[PDB]
Structure formats: structure tokens, C-alpha cells
PDB file of C-alpha atoms in Angstrom:
ATOM      1  CA  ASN M   1       0.000   0.000   0.000  1.00  0.00           C
ATOM      2  CA  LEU M   2       1.774   3.328  -0.734  1.00  0.00           C
ATOM      3  CA  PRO M   3       1.079   4.937   2.757  1.00  0.00           C
ATOM      4  CA  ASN M   4       2.626   2.183   4.867  1.00  0.00           C
ATOM      5  CA  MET M   5       5.548   2.010   2.316  1.00  0.00           C
ATOM      6  CA  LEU M   6       6.365   5.678   3.116  1.00  0.00           C
ATOM      7  CA  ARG M   7       5.434   5.755   6.817  1.00  0.00           C
ATOM      8  CA  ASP M   8       8.988   5.071   8.221  1.00  0.00           C
ATOM      9  CA  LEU M   9      10.346   7.814   6.065  1.00  0.00           C
ATOM     10  CA  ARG M  10       7.509   9.980   7.443  1.00  0.00           C
ATOM     11  CA  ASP M  11       8.323   9.081  11.107  1.00  0.00           C
ATOM     12  CA  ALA M  12      12.037   9.756  10.681  1.00  0.00           C
ATOM     13  CA  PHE M  13      11.215  13.088   9.065  1.00  0.00           C
ATOM     14  CA  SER M  14       8.891  14.170  11.972  1.00  0.00           C
ATOM     15  CA  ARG M  15      12.121  14.026  14.035  1.00  0.00           C
ATOM     16  CA  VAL M  16      14.231  15.952  11.558  1.00  0.00           C
ATOM     17  CA  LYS M  17      11.643  18.663  11.012  1.00  0.00           C
ATOM     18  CA  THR M  18      11.889  19.910  14.656  1.00  0.00           C
ATOM     19  CA  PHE M  19      15.514  21.068  13.904  1.00  0.00           C
ATOM     20  CA  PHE M  20      14.139  23.186  11.112  1.00  0.00           C
ATOM     21  CA  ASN M  21       8.375  30.220  -2.364  1.00  0.00           C
ATOM     22  CA  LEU M  22       8.915  26.425  -2.505  1.00  0.00           C
ATOM     23  CA  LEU M  23      12.351  25.118  -3.551  1.00  0.00           C
ATOM     24  CA  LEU M  24      10.638  21.853  -4.570  1.00  0.00           C
ATOM     25  CA  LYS M  25       8.397  23.418  -7.063  1.00  0.00           C
ATOM     26  CA  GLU M  26       5.347  21.904  -8.725  1.00  0.00           C
ATOM     27  CA  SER M  27       7.358  21.602 -11.889  1.00  0.00           C
ATOM     28  CA  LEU M  28       9.302  18.899 -10.134  1.00  0.00           C
ATOM     29  CA  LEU M  29       6.024  17.044  -9.554  1.00  0.00           C
ATOM     30  CA  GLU M  30       4.988  17.346 -13.145  1.00  0.00           C
ATOM     31  CA  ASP M  31       8.245  15.677 -14.338  1.00  0.00           C
ATOM     32  CA  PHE M  32       7.767  12.914 -11.713  1.00  0.00           C
ATOM     33  CA  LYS M  33       4.654  11.902 -13.391  1.00  0.00           C
ATOM     34  CA  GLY M  34       5.707  12.223 -17.085  1.00  0.00           C
ATOM     35  CA  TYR M  35       8.155  10.639 -19.673  1.00  0.00           C
ATOM     36  CA  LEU M  36      11.114  11.477 -17.521  1.00  0.00           C
ATOM     37  CA  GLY M  37       9.442  10.517 -14.150  1.00  0.00           C
ATOM     38  CA  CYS M  38      12.061   7.826 -13.209  1.00  0.00           C
ATOM     39  CA  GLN M  39      15.230   9.818 -14.253  1.00  0.00           C
ATOM     40  CA  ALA M  40      13.763  12.739 -12.094  1.00  0.00           C
ATOM     41  CA  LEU M  41      13.011  10.739  -8.964  1.00  0.00           C
ATOM     42  CA  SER M  42      16.277   8.807  -9.227  1.00  0.00           C
ATOM     43  CA  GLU M  43      18.383  12.003  -9.458  1.00  0.00           C
ATOM     44  CA  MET M  44      16.267  13.647  -6.650  1.00  0.00           C
ATOM     45  CA  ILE M  45      16.985  10.688  -4.380  1.00  0.00           C
ATOM     46  CA  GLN M  46      20.665  10.875  -5.141  1.00  0.00           C
ATOM     47  CA  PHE M  47      20.757  14.702  -4.646  1.00  0.00           C
ATOM     48  CA  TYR M  48      19.255  14.334  -1.111  1.00  0.00           C
ATOM     49  CA  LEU M  49      21.464  11.353  -0.118  1.00  0.00           C
ATOM     50  CA  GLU M  50      24.582  12.847  -1.633  1.00  0.00           C
ATOM     51  CA  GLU M  51      24.426  16.550  -1.590  1.00  0.00           C
ATOM     52  CA  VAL M  52      21.638  17.693   0.882  1.00  0.00           C
ATOM     53  CA  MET M  53      21.712  15.431   3.977  1.00  0.00           C
ATOM     54  CA  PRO M  54      25.623  15.414   4.309  1.00  0.00           C
ATOM     55  CA  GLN M  55      25.638  19.132   4.081  1.00  0.00           C
ATOM     56  CA  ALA M  56      22.908  19.353   6.680  1.00  0.00           C
ATOM     57  CA  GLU M  57      24.731  16.960   9.137  1.00  0.00           C
ATOM     58  CA  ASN M  58      27.789  19.190   8.993  1.00  0.00           C
ATOM     59  CA  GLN M  59      26.026  22.590   9.477  1.00  0.00           C
ATOM     60  CA  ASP M  60      24.522  21.184  12.668  1.00  0.00           C
ATOM     61  CA  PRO M  61      25.925  17.925  13.877  1.00  0.00           C
ATOM     62  CA  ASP M  62      23.091  17.596  16.517  1.00  0.00           C
ATOM     63  CA  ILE M  63      20.942  16.574  13.653  1.00  0.00           C
ATOM     64  CA  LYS M  64      23.259  13.553  12.681  1.00  0.00           C
ATOM     65  CA  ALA M  65      21.258  10.788  14.306  1.00  0.00           C
ATOM     66  CA  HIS M  66      17.913  11.677  12.672  1.00  0.00           C
ATOM     67  CA  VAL M  67      19.321  12.693   9.316  1.00  0.00           C
ATOM     68  CA  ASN M  68      21.203   9.384   9.208  1.00  0.00           C
ATOM     69  CA  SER M  69      17.984   7.543   9.989  1.00  0.00           C
ATOM     70  CA  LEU M  70      16.121   9.503   7.318  1.00  0.00           C
ATOM     71  CA  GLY M  71      18.884   8.675   4.685  1.00  0.00           C
ATOM     72  CA  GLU M  72      18.767   4.922   5.705  1.00  0.00           C
ATOM     73  CA  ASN M  73      14.944   4.793   5.198  1.00  0.00           C
ATOM     74  CA  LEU M  74      15.236   6.586   1.855  1.00  0.00           C
ATOM     75  CA  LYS M  75      17.962   4.043   0.700  1.00  0.00           C
ATOM     76  CA  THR M  76      15.626   1.202   1.786  1.00  0.00           C
ATOM     77  CA  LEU M  77      12.738   2.852  -0.085  1.00  0.00           C
ATOM     78  CA  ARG M  78      15.043   3.179  -3.044  1.00  0.00           C
ATOM     79  CA  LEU M  79      15.888  -0.490  -2.780  1.00  0.00           C
ATOM     80  CA  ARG M  80      12.190  -1.576  -2.734  1.00  0.00           C
ATOM     81  CA  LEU M  81      11.231   0.542  -5.809  1.00  0.00           C
ATOM     82  CA  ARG M  82      13.753  -1.597  -7.756  1.00  0.00           C
ATOM     83  CA  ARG M  83      10.906  -4.023  -8.501  1.00  0.00           C
ATOM     84  CA  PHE M  84       8.942   1.044  -9.976  1.00  0.00           C
ATOM     85  CA  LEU M  85      12.420   2.379 -10.914  1.00  0.00           C
ATOM     86  CA  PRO M  86      13.414   1.061 -14.410  1.00  0.00           C
ATOM     87  CA  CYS M  87      16.163   3.598 -14.907  1.00  0.00           C
ATOM     88  CA  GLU M  88      18.306   2.216 -11.976  1.00  0.00           C
ATOM     89  CA  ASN M  89      18.357  -1.241 -13.433  1.00  0.00           C
ATOM     90  CA  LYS M  90      20.680  -2.694 -16.211  1.00  0.00           C
ATOM     91  CA  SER M  91      19.888  -5.338 -18.870  1.00  0.00           C
ATOM     92  CA  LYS M  92      21.109  -8.818 -17.947  1.00  0.00           C
ATOM     93  CA  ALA M  93      20.967  -9.631 -21.710  1.00  0.00           C
ATOM     94  CA  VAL M  94      23.377  -6.710 -22.490  1.00  0.00           C
ATOM     95  CA  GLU M  95      25.663  -7.924 -19.664  1.00  0.00           C
ATOM     96  CA  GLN M  96      25.688 -11.355 -21.166  1.00  0.00           C
ATOM     97  CA  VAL M  97      26.631  -9.962 -24.574  1.00  0.00           C
ATOM     98  CA  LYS M  98      29.477  -7.997 -23.190  1.00  0.00           C
ATOM     99  CA  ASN M  99      30.879 -10.875 -21.141  1.00  0.00           C
ATOM    100  CA  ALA M 100      30.649 -13.250 -24.181  1.00  0.00           C
ATOM    101  CA  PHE M 101      32.246 -10.561 -26.361  1.00  0.00           C
ATOM    102  CA  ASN M 102      35.143 -10.029 -23.923  1.00  0.00           C
ATOM    103  CA  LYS M 103      35.738 -13.773 -23.370  1.00  0.00           C
ATOM    104  CA  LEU M 104      35.874 -14.228 -27.210  1.00  0.00           C
ATOM    105  CA  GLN M 105      38.541 -11.610 -27.514  1.00  0.00           C
ATOM    106  CA  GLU M 106      39.596 -10.745 -31.185  1.00  0.00           C
ATOM    107  CA  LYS M 107      36.805 -12.982 -32.435  1.00  0.00           C
ATOM    108  CA  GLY M 108      34.335 -10.934 -30.406  1.00  0.00           C
ATOM    109  CA  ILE M 109      35.147  -7.828 -32.508  1.00  0.00           C
ATOM    110  CA  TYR M 110      34.508  -9.739 -35.730  1.00  0.00           C
ATOM    111  CA  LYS M 111      31.230 -11.165 -34.543  1.00  0.00           C
ATOM    112  CA  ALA M 112      29.668  -8.023 -33.027  1.00  0.00           C
ATOM    113  CA  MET M 113      30.646  -6.105 -36.168  1.00  0.00           C
ATOM    114  CA  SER M 114      29.339  -8.807 -38.510  1.00  0.00           C
ATOM    115  CA  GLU M 115      26.082  -8.895 -36.752  1.00  0.00           C
ATOM    116  CA  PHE M 116      25.434  -5.073 -36.881  1.00  0.00           C
ATOM    117  CA  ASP M 117      22.492  -5.556 -39.214  1.00  0.00           C
ATOM    118  CA  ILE M 118      20.854  -7.859 -36.614  1.00  0.00           C
ATOM    119  CA  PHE M 119      21.341  -4.930 -34.133  1.00  0.00           C
ATOM    120  CA  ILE M 120      19.718  -2.523 -36.774  1.00  0.00           C
ATOM    121  CA  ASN M 121      16.782  -5.007 -36.916  1.00  0.00           C
ATOM    122  CA  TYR M 122      16.423  -5.058 -32.996  1.00  0.00           C
ATOM    123  CA  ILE M 123      16.467  -1.176 -32.967  1.00  0.00           C
ATOM    124  CA  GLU M 124      13.683  -1.037 -35.604  1.00  0.00           C
ATOM    125  CA  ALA M 125      11.926  -3.460 -33.242  1.00  0.00           C
ATOM    126  CA  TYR M 126      12.241  -1.090 -30.256  1.00  0.00           C
ATOM    127  CA  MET M 127      11.098   1.951 -32.272  1.00  0.00           C
ATOM    128  CA  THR M 128       8.154  -0.034 -33.540  1.00  0.00           C
ATOM    129  CA  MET M 129       7.369  -1.106 -29.914  1.00  0.00           C
ATOM    130  CA  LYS M 130       7.023   2.518 -29.156  1.00  0.00           C
ATOM    131  CA  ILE M 131       5.034   3.346 -32.314  1.00  0.00           C
ATOM    132  CA  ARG M 132       2.351   1.404 -30.450  1.00  0.00           C
TER     133      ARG M 132
ATOM    134  CA  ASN D   1       8.729   6.087 -41.017  1.00  0.00           C
ATOM    135  CA  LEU D   2      11.067   3.577 -39.286  1.00  0.00           C
ATOM    136  CA  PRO D   3      12.620   2.138 -42.570  1.00  0.00           C
ATOM    137  CA  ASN D   4      13.823   5.440 -44.013  1.00  0.00           C
ATOM    138  CA  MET D   5      15.034   6.436 -40.461  1.00  0.00           C
ATOM    139  CA  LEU D   6      17.387   3.398 -40.492  1.00  0.00           C
ATOM    140  CA  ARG D   7      18.283   3.314 -44.201  1.00  0.00           C
ATOM    141  CA  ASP D   8      21.573   5.360 -43.947  1.00  0.00           C
ATOM    142  CA  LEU D   9      22.731   3.118 -41.181  1.00  0.00           C
ATOM    143  CA  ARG D  10      21.794   0.201 -43.474  1.00  0.00           C
ATOM    144  CA  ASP D  11      23.754   1.651 -46.465  1.00  0.00           C
ATOM    145  CA  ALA D  12      26.860   2.333 -44.387  1.00  0.00           C
ATOM    146  CA  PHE D  13      26.678  -1.199 -43.014  1.00  0.00           C
ATOM    147  CA  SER D  14      26.445  -2.790 -46.541  1.00  0.00           C
ATOM    148  CA  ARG D  15      29.955  -1.305 -46.970  1.00  0.00           C
ATOM    149  CA  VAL D  16      31.292  -2.545 -43.658  1.00  0.00           C
ATOM    150  CA  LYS D  17      29.909  -6.046 -44.074  1.00  0.00           C
ATOM    151  CA  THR D  18      32.171  -6.794 -47.111  1.00  0.00           C
ATOM    152  CA  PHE D  19      35.235  -6.621 -44.738  1.00  0.00           C
ATOM    153  CA  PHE D  20      33.641  -9.330 -42.665  1.00  0.00           C
ATOM    154  CA  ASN D  21      25.510 -19.129 -32.557  1.00  0.00           C
ATOM    155  CA  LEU D  22      24.516 -15.423 -32.525  1.00  0.00           C
ATOM    156  CA  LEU D  23      26.402 -13.057 -30.190  1.00  0.00           C
ATOM    157  CA  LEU D  24      23.363 -10.738 -30.322  1.00  0.00           C
ATOM    158  CA  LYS D  25      20.990 -13.221 -28.947  1.00  0.00           C
ATOM    159  CA  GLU D  26      17.204 -13.067 -28.942  1.00  0.00           C
ATOM    160  CA  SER D  27      17.349 -12.336 -25.255  1.00  0.00           C
ATOM    161  CA  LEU D  28      18.741  -8.969 -26.202  1.00  0.00           C
ATOM    162  CA  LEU D  29      15.634  -8.385 -28.330  1.00  0.00           C
ATOM    163  CA  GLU D  30      13.308  -9.356 -25.554  1.00  0.00           C
ATOM    164  CA  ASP D  31      14.850  -6.732 -23.197  1.00  0.00           C
ATOM    165  CA  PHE D  32      14.616  -4.111 -25.996  1.00  0.00           C
ATOM    166  CA  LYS D  33      10.952  -4.447 -25.959  1.00  0.00           C
ATOM    167  CA  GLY D  34      10.303  -4.687 -22.168  1.00  0.00           C
ATOM    168  CA  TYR D  35      10.597  -2.558 -18.915  1.00  0.00           C
ATOM    169  CA  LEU D  36      14.279  -2.075 -19.457  1.00  0.00           C
ATOM    170  CA  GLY D  37      14.047  -1.493 -23.290  1.00  0.00           C
ATOM    171  CA  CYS D  38      15.637   2.035 -23.211  1.00  0.00           C
ATOM    172  CA  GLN D  39      18.499   1.243 -20.705  1.00  0.00           C
ATOM    173  CA  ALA D  40      19.307  -1.810 -23.024  1.00  0.00           C
ATOM    174  CA  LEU D  41      19.346   0.049 -26.327  1.00  0.00           C
ATOM    175  CA  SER D  42      21.211   3.002 -24.820  1.00  0.00           C
ATOM    176  CA  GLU D  43      23.996   0.779 -23.404  1.00  0.00           C
ATOM    177  CA  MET D  44      24.093  -1.267 -26.701  1.00  0.00           C
ATOM    178  CA  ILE D  45      24.613   1.938 -28.672  1.00  0.00           C
ATOM    179  CA  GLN D  46      27.365   3.031 -26.352  1.00  0.00           C
ATOM    180  CA  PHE D  47      29.046  -0.443 -26.417  1.00  0.00           C
ATOM    181  CA  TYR D  48      29.240  -0.335 -30.269  1.00  0.00           C
ATOM    182  CA  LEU D  49      30.411   3.318 -30.443  1.00  0.00           C
ATOM    183  CA  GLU D  50      32.844   2.928 -27.583  1.00  0.00           C
ATOM    184  CA  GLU D  51      34.076  -0.560 -27.365  1.00  0.00           C
ATOM    185  CA  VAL D  52      33.293  -2.413 -30.703  1.00  0.00           C
ATOM    186  CA  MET D  53      33.900  -0.016 -33.632  1.00  0.00           C
ATOM    187  CA  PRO D  54      37.251   1.445 -32.204  1.00  0.00           C
ATOM    188  CA  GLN D  55      38.510  -2.019 -31.668  1.00  0.00           C
ATOM    189  CA  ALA D  56      37.496  -2.985 -35.174  1.00  0.00           C
ATOM    190  CA  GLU D  57      39.209   0.111 -36.774  1.00  0.00           C
ATOM    191  CA  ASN D  58      42.464  -0.862 -35.100  1.00  0.00           C
ATOM    192  CA  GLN D  59      42.462  -4.613 -36.011  1.00  0.00           C
ATOM    193  CA  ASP D  60      42.126  -3.574 -39.648  1.00  0.00           C
ATOM    194  CA  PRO D  61      42.631   0.065 -40.395  1.00  0.00           C
ATOM    195  CA  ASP D  62      41.350  -0.425 -44.033  1.00  0.00           C
ATOM    196  CA  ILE D  63      37.952  -0.507 -42.512  1.00  0.00           C
ATOM    197  CA  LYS D  64      38.331   3.051 -40.888  1.00  0.00           C
ATOM    198  CA  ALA D  65      36.403   5.035 -43.464  1.00  0.00           C
ATOM    199  CA  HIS D  66      33.258   2.854 -43.404  1.00  0.00           C
ATOM    200  CA  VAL D  67      33.301   2.127 -39.696  1.00  0.00           C
ATOM    201  CA  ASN D  68      33.599   5.869 -39.059  1.00  0.00           C
ATOM    202  CA  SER D  69      30.634   6.480 -41.339  1.00  0.00           C
ATOM    203  CA  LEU D  70      28.636   3.752 -39.603  1.00  0.00           C
ATOM    204  CA  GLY D  71      29.443   5.290 -36.106  1.00  0.00           C
ATOM    205  CA  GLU D  72      28.437   8.820 -37.397  1.00  0.00           C
ATOM    206  CA  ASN D  73      25.028   7.510 -38.643  1.00  0.00           C
ATOM    207  CA  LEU D  74      24.442   5.659 -35.372  1.00  0.00           C
ATOM    208  CA  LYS D  75      25.249   8.905 -33.360  1.00  0.00           C
ATOM    209  CA  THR D  76      22.781  10.789 -35.611  1.00  0.00           C
ATOM    210  CA  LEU D  77      20.182   8.048 -35.069  1.00  0.00           C
ATOM    211  CA  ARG D  78      20.888   8.320 -31.381  1.00  0.00           C
ATOM    212  CA  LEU D  79      20.368  12.053 -31.566  1.00  0.00           C
ATOM    213  CA  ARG D  80      16.960  11.726 -33.334  1.00  0.00           C
ATOM    214  CA  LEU D  81      15.582   9.142 -30.825  1.00  0.00           C
ATOM    215  CA  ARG D  82      16.018  11.871 -28.161  1.00  0.00           C
ATOM    216  CA  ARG D  83      12.474  13.025 -28.965  1.00  0.00           C
ATOM    217  CA  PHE D  84      12.046   7.482 -28.070  1.00  0.00           C
ATOM    218  CA  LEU D  85      14.971   7.421 -25.580  1.00  0.00           C
ATOM    219  CA  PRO D  86      13.767   8.697 -22.135  1.00  0.00           C
ATOM    220  CA  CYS D  87      16.724   7.295 -20.255  1.00  0.00           C
ATOM    221  CA  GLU D  88      19.275   9.611 -22.048  1.00  0.00           C
ATOM    222  CA  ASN D  89      17.422  12.710 -21.028  1.00  0.00           C
ATOM    223  CA  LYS D  90      17.576  14.656 -17.650  1.00  0.00           C
ATOM    224  CA  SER D  91      14.795  16.588 -15.858  1.00  0.00           C
ATOM    225  CA  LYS D  92      14.944  20.342 -16.448  1.00  0.00           C
ATOM    226  CA  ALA D  93      12.872  20.714 -13.221  1.00  0.00           C
ATOM    227  CA  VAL D  94      15.565  18.808 -11.205  1.00  0.00           C
ATOM    228  CA  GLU D  95      18.250  21.011 -12.827  1.00  0.00           C
ATOM    229  CA  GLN D  96      16.364  24.072 -11.776  1.00  0.00           C
ATOM    230  CA  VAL D  97      16.139  22.821  -8.194  1.00  0.00           C
ATOM    231  CA  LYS D  98      19.798  22.151  -8.000  1.00  0.00           C
ATOM    232  CA  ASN D  99      20.811  25.509  -9.465  1.00  0.00           C
ATOM    233  CA  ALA D 100      18.419  27.363  -7.060  1.00  0.00           C
ATOM    234  CA  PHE D 101      19.743  25.255  -4.172  1.00  0.00           C
ATOM    235  CA  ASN D 102      23.390  26.025  -5.024  1.00  0.00           C
ATOM    236  CA  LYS D 103      22.765  29.763  -5.584  1.00  0.00           C
ATOM    237  CA  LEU D 104      21.018  29.898  -2.135  1.00  0.00           C
ATOM    238  CA  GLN D 105      24.022  28.408  -0.457  1.00  0.00           C
ATOM    239  CA  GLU D 106      23.582  27.665   3.363  1.00  0.00           C
ATOM    240  CA  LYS D 107      19.928  28.619   3.051  1.00  0.00           C
ATOM    241  CA  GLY D 108      19.537  26.003   0.329  1.00  0.00           C
ATOM    242  CA  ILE D 109      20.402  23.230   2.838  1.00  0.00           C
ATOM    243  CA  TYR D 110      17.763  24.489   5.265  1.00  0.00           C
ATOM    244  CA  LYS D 111      15.079  24.728   2.634  1.00  0.00           C
ATOM    245  CA  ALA D 112      15.604  21.380   0.866  1.00  0.00           C
ATOM    246  CA  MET D 113      15.716  19.680   4.271  1.00  0.00           C
ATOM    247  CA  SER D 114      12.630  21.507   5.549  1.00  0.00           C
ATOM    248  CA  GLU D 115      10.700  20.564   2.534  1.00  0.00           C
ATOM    249  CA  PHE D 116      11.496  16.770   2.699  1.00  0.00           C
ATOM    250  CA  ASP D 117       7.876  15.948   3.442  1.00  0.00           C
ATOM    251  CA  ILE D 118       6.844  17.720   0.194  1.00  0.00           C
ATOM    252  CA  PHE D 119       9.400  15.396  -1.549  1.00  0.00           C
ATOM    253  CA  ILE D 120       7.775  12.343   0.304  1.00  0.00           C
ATOM    254  CA  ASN D 121       4.402  13.572  -1.083  1.00  0.00           C
ATOM    255  CA  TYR D 122       5.818  13.833  -4.747  1.00  0.00           C
ATOM    256  CA  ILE D 123       7.273  10.250  -4.412  1.00  0.00           C
ATOM    257  CA  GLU D 124       3.875   8.880  -3.273  1.00  0.00           C
ATOM    258  CA  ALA D 125       2.597  10.700  -6.371  1.00  0.00           C
ATOM    259  CA  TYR D 126       5.031   8.877  -8.690  1.00  0.00           C
ATOM    260  CA  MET D 127       4.305   5.464  -7.127  1.00  0.00           C
ATOM    261  CA  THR D 128       0.610   6.128  -7.469  1.00  0.00           C
ATOM    262  CA  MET D 129       1.177   7.156 -11.147  1.00  0.00           C
ATOM    263  CA  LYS D 130       2.540   3.734 -11.659  1.00  0.00           C
ATOM    264  CA  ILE D 131      -0.186   1.969  -9.643  1.00  0.00           C
ATOM    265  CA  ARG D 132      -2.269   2.963 -12.663  1.00  0.00           C
TER     266      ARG D 132
END
């Protein structure tokens, strides 16, 4: 259920908020729910875990305990959405290709080049997927 | 039309192919047309432009001219799909937030932290977008 998924994050925040024109404008919400929704959320999660919360723990170290619990719940949330967050995921099939390619060595070059028309056919397949 | 979009890439390849168990398995096609379709295509384009074609121009430098034309048509194709390739795109709204945040300096930290519940509300909004 989306409430009880976000509730721990909400309880950690009710602790952080006592130590504290929107910055997080409505435009940010509109991109969260469009074409780029996943790229937007994923970079917003990384900007808070990477840039905002560390900066905040250093301006006032009395916040460390709660900010570190809020960052831990947001990494957990981030981990669950990777079931919701396509853009944080990589293709196992592409990983297979690259490991086969690298184990084949000089022969790999030959093969991946020789098959470029098969790759042109798979691309037309993706763009046709999306024509739908 | 998807044929005439891919035709230059096809004509450059009919030049390259005269200097030359699939490596580009059907599993790769299945990921091109699923959840991860865009991450898969995007990394496959980068693996050919970055790893395969340079390796191929060095094993046999007589191929340079045609391989360099095939790489140029695939970068152009890649440029057109960014209208088709969501995962290569970044959120202008997230860029705005970060530039506002950095121009605000110490006040930016305060503000982005104080607004974390607004961010928790936008996230529930994305996961509800996707519940649909």
C-alpha cells in the first residue's frame, strides 16, 4: 500500500523537522509523473542522499542521528522501488553480450561487427514497440 | 517512417559487411521491448560506439572510413531518438532545483531539508502514477 511504504520515512522526518516560495516546485512534480518521471526521482533521491543530507549533518551535527535515519529509510525505499524504478536497473541480456564478447577476444570484434544488421533489426523493433 | 530512419545506417553497413551461434541473442531483443528497453538500447549503442567499432578500426585500419561512417550515422540516429529514448534525457525541473539550491548556499540546505515531506508527497505521487 503506498502509505505504509512511506510511513517510516515519514516518522524519521517528523524528528528531523523539529531542527528546522517552494524550492521543490510543482514543476518537479509534473516531471515525476511524465516521460522522464524515473530519471527525475532517481536524481532527486541521489541529490538528497549525496548533496543535501551530508551538508545538513555538517552545518549542525546535533541533527546527525535523525538525518542518518532519514537517509537509511530513503535508501531502503530506493531499494524496494527496484521491482517502480526502471532507470536504476541494467539489462542482464546486455551484460551477457558484453561478457561473451570479452571472453571471445579478437573474435568478439569480428562477430559483433558482422552482426550489426541484426542490431539494426532489434532497434527497428524497439522503435516499432514505441510506435504502439 | 522507421525504414527510411534506419536506411543510412543500413547503407553504411552494406559497406562494412564486405570486410567481414549469434552473439546478439534473442534475449537482447526481448529486453529491448520490455521494462528495461531504453536502458538496453542506450547501453548497446554506447558499447558499439565505444568498445566495438574502435577495436574494429584498429584490427584492420582499411575498414576506418566505413566504420567511421557507420558510427556517425548511429550517433545521428541516437540524436533523433532523443524526442524514443527517455533514459538519455535529464529533468529540467531537477536542474532548476539544483541551481536554485546552489545559488542559495547555506539557506539552500535548510530549505531542501525543511521541505522533505513535500518530496515524500511527490514520491507517493510517482508510485501512485505507476499503480495505474
